[model samples]
Target: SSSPVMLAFKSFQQELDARHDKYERLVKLSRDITVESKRTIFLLHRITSAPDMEDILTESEIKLDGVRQKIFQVAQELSGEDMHQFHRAITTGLQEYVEAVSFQHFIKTRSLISMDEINKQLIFTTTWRLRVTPVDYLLGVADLTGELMRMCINSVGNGDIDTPFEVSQFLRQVYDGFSFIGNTGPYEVSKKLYTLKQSLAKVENACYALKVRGSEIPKHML
Candidate 1:
């Protein structure tokens, strides 16, 4: 006995309510991570650029900036109140690191050794270090993101809510964030992160389509 227009409106309202509840959960999760990110930033300041050579040091400010950006994104997604402050912190830190890397590279080239040869070796070493540090950190972010997505998928059910879709979208954003520094030459740790990302997408798709309770939604539709 309900009009078609009224039925459509009810459906939309129900969906919105579902999304709102899910967002509430996401907000709590984000706040916790924001605090954790602040701690990680403190440790990042002390991270060494060179693992073997004590003389070779990187400006913490630089590394901190780049690291801050990634965390800032997470804070925003999670609804942290002071996200803007961290956003600025990340920018300044990244700028410093870039400048320090350039200065260090200049010093390397100025030495009597062939600039090209030294650069080649430096690349390999830096890549190796990245596999362990920034890359490793990024991978951790990815794993957390995948877990959140899985949680969202489970949160949606006949009597539950419609937050699964938005959560899935947020997970994708986090996955892309992790992939910002993808594929740095056969890194064991980095590779695992990439694999996990793929797995998350794979499993999410299976949930939406292959499950008996629901039908598959195409990527284009998602």
Candidate 2:
């Protein structure tokens, strides 16, 4: 009963479904990452851990890495789409965004601005945005990432011929990763990084699942 046209259509459907699932999971991860980033920034403001530069960098790196991973995961999902626009935007643009803020803070601390000033700018501003840190600009970044995830999800759900299903599995990674970083065990940092690594692995799983199921497969199609 199945004609060649029907068979080709079925294959096409399968690929679309796979892509949909991948982006769905990605959106979930991104949400979790955004929340954890806020929490980390909160902790930074509340506590004064020693005055060691290394310690500061270590904690700062933890916060940024959580966010970096979220953007990276989203970018990975975007890469599979016909719309290279979002893919390129997330991959290159977001990276520069995070790096620019980081380097600026680094220079601020190293030269003119004191640690107190860095805290003033990055921590105090969070209150105005995500109730996390005061870095209003970083909060802006978080907002952008969240918007991107929603766009991806909406695209998928709408059955757009282009990119869709931007999930937020990265949020889970941020949560787990933040806890790991906060731990005081013998291998705490390593442990946290490992958890974050697992999160990235989940992105791969999502991507593959979506690829097999086919991109742009609608829930109705399923």
Candidate 3:
């Protein structure tokens, strides 16, 4: 009963249980982040229509800060092998966070959010602490294109013609920046680039229609 094989099997079982526990905790945290971040994204989408824009932004920032703290605590639980093994679970929330912030910043300022800005806004993920990898940051920014495309279409429905032209140029620049990544990025990044291009095309088509048809509508009607 005390044979080396039996001892090793027991040790492996303990390790498996520990890893399972870690993953379960991480999955639960990731879900929380996803839910909170989705709400933040939804709030950000109401920027143009919301009566209290700053209040909405402030509320989102508070929610995001809470998520960031939780993420940092989870990051501390992971190291080396655990970090590698549970990378997806660990970063899912972070990616969603990135998407929300990037989209919000773009809409408010009409500019792409810099990593410095993202890092500054984050409560954790500094050089000394947990770090959000470049790929995650880029992927988050890549996902912003889809949100922008949806906003473009919505703006059209709301009689905002100029926004589509502006967003088209902005998206084109983003697409060009992503093109520099080429095949060198991660598999997910590569996969996301295809969707990014599709978003850019949709925005471009919207811009074309606006340019061709917008002049027909009287200024008073607009």
Candidate 4:
């Protein structure tokens, strides 16, 4: 072992060390979208069947607006050369943020929010624009199913009485679409599919329970 046996090996090792450095900022500056978004998700989920239910949406709307305020900072951080490799860094926040939005959107209109609309929200928020990858959007929607399943059960228990069927039909449609995408989807979708199906089952179960309850109790109010 002389002074410097292999300078090339030393330089290569330095490059190896430096390679990991490139993505650190991504993980660092990646807004904690999950934290605030999840807080809004919790608040939004509090909207059970009640006269005050509409009020909850407006309250969460304020908190969700806070969530978006943070995402603009993320836009500024990420509006550079593509970080396809570091897509990992932003995904945690991205998925949670979408979950928050989709959850609120579904309850508000009983409609699905498309990626196009989601991106439109981003475009107007800040002069800088960023688009979500299919992986993020699809996976985020998959997560949304679980929240929907919980809402279905809560709605039935709270006597809203109609949401479970609506959620059931929506989930069945979503499952049908996801069924067409197996291993063909980005790797994460495969994992998410299992969770989506679990939610589907719970939602379906809620519908069956409600059908029996209402049919047994009162035929049809209308």
Judging by lDDT against the true structure, name the best candidate: 4
Compose the digit string of candidate 2's lDDT tens values, residues 195-217. 44454455445445556777555
Highest TM-score scorer: 3
Stretches of model 2 off by over 4 angstroms after superposition: 47-57, 83-222
Lowest lDDT block of 10, candidate 4: 22-31
How much is the lDDT of residue 144 in candidate 2?
A: 31
Candidate 3 backbone collisions, by pair: none
Alpha-carbon local distance difference test for all models = 0.43, 0.43, 0.80, 0.81
Estimate the TM-score for candidate 2.
0.36
For candidate 1, give the lDDT of residue 215. 53
Q: Per-prediction count of colliding residue pairs?
A: 4, 40, 0, 0
Candidate 1 per-residue lDDT over residues 1-222, each given as its tens digit: 399999998999997886565455445444444444444333332322236223323343344345434434444443433434333333323222222333233233321222233223223211221111343334344444444444454444333344455445555665664467567523744655656667567556745753445554556753
Mind giving the per-residue lDDT tens digits that candidate 3 earns over 1-222?
799999999999999998888888888888887788878888777766446778877887787777777666666666545466887786777788788888878767899988877877554444224566798898888888898998888888788878888889999998998888788887889899889989999999988888888568565853
TM-score of each: 0.30, 0.36, 0.85, 0.83
Better of 2 and 3 by lDDT: 3
Candidate 2 has its poorest 10 consecutive residues by lDDT at 124-133
Better of 2 and 3 by TM-score: 3
